[PDB]
Design a protein around this ligand. Structure first.
Ligand SMILES: [Mg+2]
Ligand SMILES: [Zn+2]
Ligand SMILES: [Zn+2]
Ligand SMILES: [Zn+2]
Lengths: 268, 171, 549, 93, 174, 84, 105, 98
RNA sequence: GCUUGUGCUGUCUUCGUCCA
């Protein structure tokens, strides 16, 4: 059934007739071998913990960035444009939290397979550039904001200037952009990871390159791979379950063995 | 009759010739392999117009054999006789079974059964000829004949002429 | 390059157009007419011309060339002959479709029972797919049980009542409601009547019915001339040193031809209708069973041994049929099979190959100016000394066998020749274990020639193969080209297959006593002396020569 | 080299190895097809260098193919049953 | 070997009588049909060539190739020897000999005027190019002779055949 | 008509693994058939190794033609495709 | 359908990546109705006759194709496998041309 | 004739016990008559009248001829049985079990 | 100068081997 299905050069998944099965393989265009379980940090935790972790206030002194971690802590307090930038970042984070918590993952599960491991990249940067010691960073906040914002626009899954292409490209990387913004927040970068400048450009370049390397290759015979990946477990394995239930599903049997409903009641 | 035709040729090139002079070499190979050949479908290809500015395109690598395949399109002058056509000729040989004439590259054989009876073959004449009272057709004599049939061979064309109708024979 | 030169251009198939064979085409493509039932002329060689083993049909003997193409046995594809049928017979595979077409049209005027005036009929004709178009037209015209000589103005019909057709074996019964109740007559619908009715179908009606005017004309579903396949399709087998056995298809064709002769003889001499019906029904049965011997509802045709006849349809179906058993998967050359064993001292992507298997298998290497010296050495060593060679192949394609050559040292290699050298170290080979459940069951290893007669694997790869060393066997396939070698080394190589796309986790890990020993060795209270540490450090291939404090 | 091995080779994406296994390391064959009728009825005589399809009465529009011998046998058995599989080397739309 | 720009031509069932080659009936077959297509697929007319036009074209192309092969630095024998291939050399020699020994018009301007007369004429706007080539080639002198040699012109009685023949004879160099 | 202009090429700018494998195989076969080598060979003798050396230096004289589902195609030179 | 398949697979603790089951359930529901994975589901498509006959009902499919004059465009992988051709898959999903411009160096 | 060697056969076409044999060697020599051709034209009695039907040893096997039995079948024709013996020493790949 | 020897059925059935 699935033999003649292949990823084409425009990203779509089509059969031999040219009929579209999917408009993007796996709905994200990634390869099955290039994903790993990662935690999205904006999903879990109470509102107070989220605010404490991500909010930065440049007017109140005790709710600001610590002065021993940044060289320029003197001329930061009282700035209003930089506060506008930080507020935009925090609003983006809150929107991501709402989108993930109310639409995608309603049950709050935050451990999902996603491309390019961010934790590994960050600790590699820390080991490479010797980011220990109480030395103060020279990484200005606008550089952080603009670098992350620009990075979230260079994750190309689809090439082209078409408006519909741009919309599909933006859709394809929503979860991954949420992950990246959750990890590379301003407060986390300056305090938790203590990256300097060179580490920051290295991290951005590495993220972009690894994402480009994790895409699916045109010419994959994904139908056969899917068929094998589904049939392989079946060889090693009151409701019906197991091979009889799989046979019922695949045959689309009209009268299954144990029909059932799952009626949910109102809140009261 | 001569014509202009747009023809195409498939040319296969060995990898040992994959050099900067690939295009010119393909051009001379095409010229050597097309000029003067005889195809029954088209007739005789005599010349290729614009022989030094022929587009060859991009060659495709044959999977499993390495050699590249080129599609060459060109315009050439082609001559082909047609059934029931009257053309000029020059007699090349005289024989009791008939005489052989030449119409360009084509050699046409005319049997005695397609020759007027008054043109009795004279073997005593020097050179021997098919002669009448007022007509004498020998080697090198201009003759106007009508092609009746054409025979297709592997790379050759055999035509049969006749002079038995009016405005034919010696000219 | 293994085929003799042919001036015709070499191209690849881009479309396969199906259809039926018109009797005109069968007569045109044929090369001889088959009429004599006797297979052999006088049992003195030289099979009878015009018989089932005519030499013009093709040659299956080494010393005999085909009389039609003049090519040898290895090149002759076989040529068809045709057999004229005395009376047309039904094609066993199209009887239901013939019945449906008879239901869709009138049996007298040869026109459709419905017209485009009906909105539903026009809607049905509007569709594109021939099968669905025919289904819709049949669903509509099935109810219409009477031809109309007038518009429902004359529509071209004859006004006759349409009979109801019922299937009974190979015979179709048509029941007319001849003129509340009266006496209706059901009479046999002979193939000839249906054929001459179908020939009067207009091309537009034929297109409306789903048939194609150029390729699949409805009256071609009735067989009037039979194509006789060449002996290549029905080869004979020598049962013993003296007596050879005729194939099943040959015997069935002999029976069909005998029935044809019987019908022709009976027709011209004297015609009792009962005898004619019996003999023509016998001919229909033979022709039908020649192409399908599993017709439900009637006994099968049996051989003199009692086994059922292997019809052409049975050749194509099942695991052992043509499609599954010879086209989708087939036996291949340049392969080996033996028991597997474990070797802790092999790299992950290495397989240990016995010397005898390495000598038997080969890889054709093109002679260039980078390897002519080495290849000459291999040619000198001969097919019994490793490293060696088995054949030398010239540019023209001729093979020089090095076993039977007395002047092997007197061979000079020219550029472009091929030397079928022995299998050597670091040659990529495909390695496989059945059943092949997933794509990690076929991986490409690097050859290492070793003594003794078992394949040897690093034990980490026993997990993807689902293999252990209690008697399992695995298959080895040798690539025979530079392109194929590159594909194996760049796509299927073992290191590239460590992480699987099924669950984005590795499929190979430390297993068995290596796992047990890495647990025991890394306990908190395991201490190692200097002299043992030196040996353990030297064992690491990637060690940099610095001993840790 | 059964069907499951063929599926594994498809999953790997190695088309060249699959073609070589099923043609060069097995029953490879050369046939001639008429460029008009599309049938394998060309009476080809390689030594005399003349090709000819009697049904279509042509000598020029003739091509050669490399197909498995089992495919040739299957097409001939189909022709034995009045089915005509026509092989064409160009698409039409 | 060489393939025409016309392809397809698959199997059918109808058979036509306008398939056999016949000069008198002006049935030149599919590859020599009145409508042709160039490399761009656009409409194109069948291009016949009289011996004058053919000689002019072959001489021009051969001398251009000879000049190109010598780095851009007249005799028919030398011009034939320019080409490669002994059989090709012989074929071009024979064609050149035929054209020279039957050249009705050896001048470019005479051929240009003849082509203009045979093309721009109102009567000749319907004449088939094969008929035009035959008229310019055979060098006929009489209406009856031309009709006998060219049966196609018999059905075209709207042609000023005699005066056109006299014009050709005038243009013919004596 | 079917060809896509260089300015409007929308496929990936990287050499996929299938394209890399096919290019290496074809180049190795061509070198084994005595094609000219466009890079200096120090001591290498294996055609596949020479092909890999050529590919690393962007010296392979081959063109990839990527077929879109509708029949149109894009021609990419192996010297302008990024290789990992 | 995805939920049921995942429930069957993950009952014994096994894990299969999402994209494979997504592809399967997108194939089963791509025609607007549930297409069973049987001969009555697969063989009732518009795919080539040669591809369809290789699965089940070979002879019946071949007769139906012959009577209906079906045309196979040889775009599938089974058609190219059984004809000994380079399938339009993997390394055969493109063409290699010769770069006459680069060879000028 | 078979490509093996016939030099180990005795006068009666049967190998004798105690002779070491290898793969493809001929252990039973048998011929079947064939109608002669026109070779009697000028052949000095050296024309083929019989066709070989010999029994070769299996290609992968070798050993010592242990015992040769010669007798008559139920029909009164000759009938032979040849038994070959070899020793198999354990080696890498042999299967054992408790 | 006496000169070296190339070829194999087929169809059933059963019993086994390794996975499952
Ligand atoms: Mg085991
Ligand atoms: Zn033959
Ligand atoms: Zn009627
Ligand atoms: Zn034909």
């Amino acid at each position: 059934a699935l033999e003649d299905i292949m990823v084409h050069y425009d990203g779509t998944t089509r059969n031999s007739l040219g009929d579209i099965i999917q408009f993007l393989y796996g709905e994200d265009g990634l390869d099955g071998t290039q994903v790993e379980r990662q935690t999205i940090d904006t999903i879990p935790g109470s509102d107070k913990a989220f605010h404490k972790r991500y909010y930065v206030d440049l007017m109140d002194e005790k709710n600001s960035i610590k002065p021993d971690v940044i060289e320029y802590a003197a001329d930061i307090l009282g700035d209003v444009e930089l506060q506008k930038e930080l507020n935009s970042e925090y609003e983006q984070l809150v929107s991501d939290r709402k989108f993930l918590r109310e639409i995608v993952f309603v049950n709050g599960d935050h451990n999902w397979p996603l491309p390019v491991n961010l934790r590994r990249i960050i600790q590699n940067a820390q080991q490479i550039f010797h980011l220990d010691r109480a030395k103060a960073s020279d990484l200005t906040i606008p550089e952080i904001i603009h670098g992350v914002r620009d990075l979230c626009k260079k994750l190309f899954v689809l090439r082209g200037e078409n408006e519909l292409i741009k919309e599909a490209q933006q859709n394809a990387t929503s979860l991954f952009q949420c992950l990246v913004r959750a990890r590379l927040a301003t407060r986390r970068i300056l305090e938790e990871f203590r990256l300097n400048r060179d580490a920051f450009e290295w991290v951005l370049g590495t993220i972009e390159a690894q994402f480009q390397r994790s895409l699916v290759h045109p010419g994959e015979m994904v139908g056969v791979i899917a068929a094998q990946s589904i049939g392989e477990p079946a060889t090693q394995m009151n409701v019906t379950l197991g091979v009889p239930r799989l046979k019922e599903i695949l045959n689309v049997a009209k009268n299954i063995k144990t029909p059932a409903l799952t009626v949910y009641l109102d809140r009261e | 009759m001569f014509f202009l035709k747009d023809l195409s040729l498939i040319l296969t090139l060995h990898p040992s010739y994959f050099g900067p002079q690939m295009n010119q070499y393909l051009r001379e190979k095409l010229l050597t392999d097309v000029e003067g050949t005889c195809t029954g479908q088209f007739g005789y290809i005599v010349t290729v117009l614009d022989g030094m500015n022929i587009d060859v395109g991009k060659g495709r690598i044959i999977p499993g054999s390495g050699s590249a395949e080129f599609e060459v399109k060109y315009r050439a002058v082609v001559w082909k006789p047609f059934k029931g056509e009257v053309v000029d000729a020059i007699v090349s040989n005289v024989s009791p079974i008939g005489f052989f004439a030449d119409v360009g590259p084509l050699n046409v054989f005319v049997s005695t059964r397609l020759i007027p009876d008054n043109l009795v073959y004279n073997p005593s004449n020097s050179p021997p000829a098919y002669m009448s009272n007022d007509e004498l057709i020998t080697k090198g004599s201009k003759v106007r004949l009508k092609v009746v049939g054409t025979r297709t061979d592997v790379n050759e064309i055999y035509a049969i002429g006749s002079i038995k109708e009016d405005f034919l024979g010696a000219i | 390059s293994q085929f003799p030169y042919s001036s015709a251009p070499l191209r690849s198939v881009k479309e396969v157009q199906f259809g039926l064979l018109s009797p005109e085409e069968i007569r045109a493509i044929s090369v001889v007419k088959i009429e004599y039932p006797e297979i052999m002329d006088e049992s003195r060689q030289r099979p009878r011309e015009g018989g089932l083993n005519d030499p013009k049909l093709g040659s299956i003997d080494r010393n005999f060339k085909c009389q039609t193409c003049g090519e040898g046995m290895a090149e002759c594809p076989g040529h068809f002959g045709h057999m004229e049928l005395a009376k047309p017979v039904f094609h066993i595979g199209f009887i239901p479709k013939i019945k449906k077409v008879c239901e869709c049209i009138c049996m007298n005027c040869g026109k459709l029972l419905l017209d485009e005036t009906n909105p539903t009929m026009a809607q049905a004709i509007r569709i594109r797919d021939p099968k669905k178009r025919f289904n819709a037209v049949w669903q509509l015209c099935k109810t219409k049980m009477v031809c109309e000589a007038d518009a429902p103005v004359s529509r071209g019909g004859c006004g006759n009542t349409q009979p109801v057709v019922r299937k009974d074996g190979m015979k179709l019964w048509g029941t007319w409601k001849k003129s509340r109740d009266a006496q209706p007559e059901r009479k046999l619908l002979t193939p000839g009547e249906i054929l001459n009715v179908f020939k009067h179908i207009s091309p537009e009606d034929c297109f409306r019915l789903g048939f194609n005017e150029d390729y699949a004309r409805p009256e071609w579903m009735i067989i009037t001339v039979l194509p006789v396949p060449p002996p290549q399709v029905r080869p004979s087998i020598a049962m013993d040193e003296t007596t050879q056995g005729q194939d099943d298809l040959t015997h069935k064709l002999s029976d069909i031809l005998k029935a044809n002769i019987n019908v022709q003889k009976l027709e011209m001499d004297g015609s009792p209708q009962h005898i004619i019906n019996e003999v023509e029904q016998l001919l229909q049965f033979h022709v039908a069973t020649y192409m399908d011997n599993d017709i439900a509802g009637q006994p099968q045709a049996l051989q003199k041994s009692g086994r059922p006849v292997k019809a052409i349809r049975a050749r194509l179906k099942g695991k052992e049929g043509r499609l599954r058993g010879n086209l989708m998967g087939k036996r291949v050359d340049f392969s080996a099979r033996t028991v597997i064993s474990g070797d802790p001292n092999l790299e992950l992507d290495q397989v240990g190959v016995p010397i005898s298997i390495a000598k038997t298998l080969s890889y054709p290497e093109t002679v260039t100016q980078y390897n002519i010296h080495r290849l000459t050495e291999y040619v000198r060593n001969g097919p019994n000394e490793h490293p060696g060679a088995k054949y030398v192949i010239r540019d023209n394609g001729d093979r020089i066998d090095l076993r039977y050559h007395k002047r092997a040292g007197d061979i000079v290699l020219q550029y472009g020749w091929k030397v079928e050298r022995h299998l050597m170290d670091d040659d990529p080979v495909l390695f496989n274990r059945q059943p092949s459940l997933h794509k990690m069951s076929m991986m490409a290893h690097r050859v290492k020639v070793m003594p003794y007669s078992t394949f040897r694997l690093n034990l980490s790869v026993t997990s993807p193969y689902n293999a252990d060393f209690d008697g399992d066997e695995m298959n080895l396939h040798v690539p025979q080209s530079e392109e194929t070698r590159a594909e194996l080394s760049q796509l299927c190589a073992v290191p590239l297959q460590i992480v699987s796309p099924q669950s984005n986790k590795p499929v190979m890990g430390i297993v068995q006593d290596t796992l047990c020993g890495v647990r025991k060795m890394t306990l908190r209270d395991t201490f190692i002396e200097y002299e043992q540490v030196m040996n353990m450090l030297f064992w690491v291939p990637s060690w940099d020569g610095v001993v840790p404090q | 080299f059964g069907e499951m091995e063929r599926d594994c080779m498809i999953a790997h994406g190695a088309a060249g190895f699959l073609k070589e296994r099923l043609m060069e390391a097995s029953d490879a064959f050369r046939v001639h097809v008429c460029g008009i009728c599309g049938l394998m009825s060309v009476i080809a005589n390689l030594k005399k260098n003349q090709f000819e399809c009697r049904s279509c009465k042509n000598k020029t529009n003739i091509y050669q193919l490399h197909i498995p011998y089992a495919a040739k046998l299957l097409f001939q058995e189909l022709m034995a049953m009045n089915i005509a599989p026509r092989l064409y080397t160009e698409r039409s739309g | 070997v060489s393939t025409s720009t016309v392809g397809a031509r698959r199997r059918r069932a109808k058979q036509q009588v306008d398939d056999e080659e016949n000069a008198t009936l002006l049935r030149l077959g599919p590859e020599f049909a009145l409508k042709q297509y160039d490399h761009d697929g656009n409409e194109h007319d069948l291009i016949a060539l009289s011996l004058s036009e053919s000689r002019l074209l072959i001489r021009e192309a051969l001398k251009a190739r000879s000049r190109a092969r010598n780095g851009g630095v007249i005799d028919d024998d030398e011009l034939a020897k320019v080409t490669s291939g002994a059989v090709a050399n012989g074929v071009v020699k024979k064609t050149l000999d035929y054209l020279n020994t039957f050249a009705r018009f050896k001048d470019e301007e005479t051929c240009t005027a003849v082509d203009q007369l045979l093309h721009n004429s109102s009567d000749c706007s319907v004449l088939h190019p094969f008929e035009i080539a035959q008229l310019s080639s055979l060098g006929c002198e009489d209406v009856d002779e031309a009709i006998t040699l060219i049966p196609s012109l018999a059905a075209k009685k709207e042609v000023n055949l005699q005066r056109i023949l006299d014009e050709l004879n005038r243009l013919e160099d004596p | 008509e079917l060809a896509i202009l260089k300015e409007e090429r929308t496929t990936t700018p990287y050499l996929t693994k299938y394209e890399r494998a096919r290019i290496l195989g074809t180049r190795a076969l061509q070198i084994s058939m005595n094609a000219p080598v466009l890079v200096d060979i120090e001591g290498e003798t294996d055609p596949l190794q020479i092909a890999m050396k050529e590919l690393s230096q962007r010296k392979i004289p081959l063109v990839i033609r990527r077929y879109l589902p509708d029949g149109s195609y894009e021609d990419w030179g192996c010297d302008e495709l990024i290789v990992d | 359908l995805y939920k049921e398949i995942l429930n069957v697979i993950a009952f014994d603790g096994s894990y299969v990546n999402y994209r494979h089951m997504a592809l399967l359930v997108d194939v089963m529901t791509s025609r607007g109705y549930l297409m069973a994975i049987t001969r009555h589901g697969i063989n009732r498509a518009d795919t080539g006759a040669l591809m369809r006959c290789s699965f089940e009902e070979t002879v019946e499919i071949l007769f139906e194709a012959g009577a209906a004059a079906e045309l196979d465009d040889c775009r599938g992988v089974s058609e190219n496998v059984m004809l000994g051709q380079l399938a339009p898959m993997g390394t055969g999903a493109f063409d290699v041309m010769i770069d006459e411009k680069l060879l000028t160096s | 004739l078979k490509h093996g060697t016939y030099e180990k056969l005795d006068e009666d076409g049967l190998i004798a016990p105690g002779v070491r044999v290898s793969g493809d060697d001929i252990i039973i020599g048998k011929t079947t008559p064939i109608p002669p051709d026109t070779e009697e034209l000028g052949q000095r009695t050296k024309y083929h009248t019989k066709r070989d039907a010999s029994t070769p040893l299996r290609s992968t096997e070798n050993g010592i001829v242990d015992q040769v039995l010669l007798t008559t079948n139920q029909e009164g024709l000759k009938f032979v049985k040849v038994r070959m013996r070899t020793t198999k020493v354990p080696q890498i790949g042999d299967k054992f079990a408790s």
